[PDB]
Design a protein around this motif. Structure first.
Motif, PDB file in Angstrom:
ATOM      1  N   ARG A   1       6.957 -13.963   4.154  1.00  0.00           N
ATOM      2  CA  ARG A   1       7.361 -15.343   3.792  1.00  0.00           C
ATOM      3  C   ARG A   1       6.495 -15.801   2.595  1.00  0.00           C
ATOM      4  O   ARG A   1       6.308 -15.024   1.665  1.00  0.00           O
ATOM      5  N   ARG A   2       5.928 -17.013   2.611  1.00  0.00           N
ATOM      6  CA  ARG A   2       5.007 -17.487   1.552  1.00  0.00           C
ATOM      7  C   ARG A   2       3.538 -17.277   1.986  1.00  0.00           C
ATOM      8  O   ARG A   2       2.818 -18.219   2.317  1.00  0.00           O
ATOM      9  N   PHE A   3       3.227 -15.996   2.166  1.00  0.00           N
ATOM     10  CA  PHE A   3       1.895 -15.462   2.510  1.00  0.00           C
ATOM     11  C   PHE A   3       1.819 -13.969   2.163  1.00  0.00           C
ATOM     12  O   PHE A   3       2.562 -13.156   2.708  1.00  0.00           O
ATOM     13  N   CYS A   4       1.020 -13.683   1.145  1.00  0.00           N
ATOM     14  CA  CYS A   4       0.701 -12.304   0.758  1.00  0.00           C
ATOM     15  C   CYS A   4      -0.663 -11.860   1.320  1.00  0.00           C
ATOM     16  O   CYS A   4      -1.603 -12.630   1.461  1.00  0.00           O
ATOM     17  N   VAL A   5      -0.681 -10.583   1.707  1.00  0.00           N
ATOM     18  CA  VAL A   5      -1.866  -9.912   2.266  1.00  0.00           C
ATOM     19  C   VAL A   5      -2.204  -8.637   1.458  1.00  0.00           C
ATOM     20  O   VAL A   5      -1.290  -7.993   0.925  1.00  0.00           O
ATOM     21  N   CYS A   6      -3.493  -8.340   1.331  1.00  0.00           N
ATOM     22  CA  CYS A   6      -3.899  -7.043   0.746  1.00  0.00           C
ATOM     23  C   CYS A   6      -4.942  -6.228   1.533  1.00  0.00           C
ATOM     24  O   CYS A   6      -6.031  -6.712   1.849  1.00  0.00           O
ATOM     25  N   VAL A   7      -4.668  -4.926   1.612  1.00  0.00           N
ATOM     26  CA  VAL A   7      -5.433  -3.959   2.448  1.00  0.00           C
ATOM     27  C   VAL A   7      -5.528  -2.505   1.889  1.00  0.00           C
ATOM     28  O   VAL A   7      -4.707  -2.072   1.076  1.00  0.00           O
ATOM     29  N   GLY A   8      -6.547  -1.809   2.379  1.00  0.00           N
ATOM     30  CA  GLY A   8      -6.778  -0.372   2.108  1.00  0.00           C
ATOM     31  C   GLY A   8      -6.494   0.513   3.333  1.00  0.00           C
ATOM     32  O   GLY A   8      -7.384   0.725   4.160  1.00  0.00           O
ATOM     33  N   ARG A   9      -5.256   0.998   3.423  1.00  0.00           N
ATOM     34  CA  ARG A   9      -4.798   1.830   4.551  1.00  0.00           C
ATOM     35  C   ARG A   9      -3.744   2.871   4.106  1.00  0.00           C
ATOM     36  O   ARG A   9      -2.544   2.650   4.140  1.00  0.00           O
TER      37      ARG A   9
ATOM     38  N   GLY B   1      -9.302   4.360   2.408  1.00  0.00           N
ATOM     39  CA  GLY B   1      -8.894   4.547   0.998  1.00  0.00           C
ATOM     40  C   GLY B   1      -7.445   4.098   0.749  1.00  0.00           C
ATOM     41  O   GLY B   1      -6.646   4.067   1.688  1.00  0.00           O
ATOM     42  N   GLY B   2      -7.153   3.855  -0.533  1.00  0.00           N
ATOM     43  CA  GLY B   2      -5.877   3.286  -0.994  1.00  0.00           C
ATOM     44  C   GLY B   2      -5.904   1.749  -1.043  1.00  0.00           C
ATOM     45  O   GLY B   2      -6.904   1.121  -0.680  1.00  0.00           O
ATOM     46  N   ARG B   3      -4.862   1.194  -1.656  1.00  0.00           N
ATOM     47  CA  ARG B   3      -4.637  -0.277  -1.711  1.00  0.00           C
ATOM     48  C   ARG B   3      -3.160  -0.601  -1.973  1.00  0.00           C
ATOM     49  O   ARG B   3      -2.525   0.038  -2.816  1.00  0.00           O
ATOM     50  N   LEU B   4      -2.657  -1.586  -1.231  1.00  0.00           N
ATOM     51  CA  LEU B   4      -1.350  -2.214  -1.509  1.00  0.00           C
ATOM     52  C   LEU B   4      -1.271  -3.607  -0.861  1.00  0.00           C
ATOM     53  O   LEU B   4      -2.006  -3.897   0.085  1.00  0.00           O
ATOM     54  N   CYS B   5      -0.530  -4.482  -1.535  1.00  0.00           N
ATOM     55  CA  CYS B   5      -0.313  -5.873  -1.096  1.00  0.00           C
ATOM     56  C   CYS B   5       1.172  -6.096  -0.754  1.00  0.00           C
ATOM     57  O   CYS B   5       2.062  -5.596  -1.438  1.00  0.00           O
TER      58      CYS B   5
END
Lengths: 18, 18
Positions: free
Chosen positions: B10-18, B2-6
């Motif tokens: 550098r010039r690479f964005c990631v998104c996850v639920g942790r 549960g949850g979400r944040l990105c």
């Protein structure tokens, strides 16, 4: 959510769980 | 999980639920 894949828009790759 | 944040590394964005 569940799943993972990275895509490159020009010279920046982005990784999501969707 | 549960949850979400990105974040950007550098010039690479990631998104996850942790």
């Amino acid at each position: 959510r569940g799943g993972r894949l990275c895509y490159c828009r020009r010279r920046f790759c982005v990784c999501v769980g969707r």
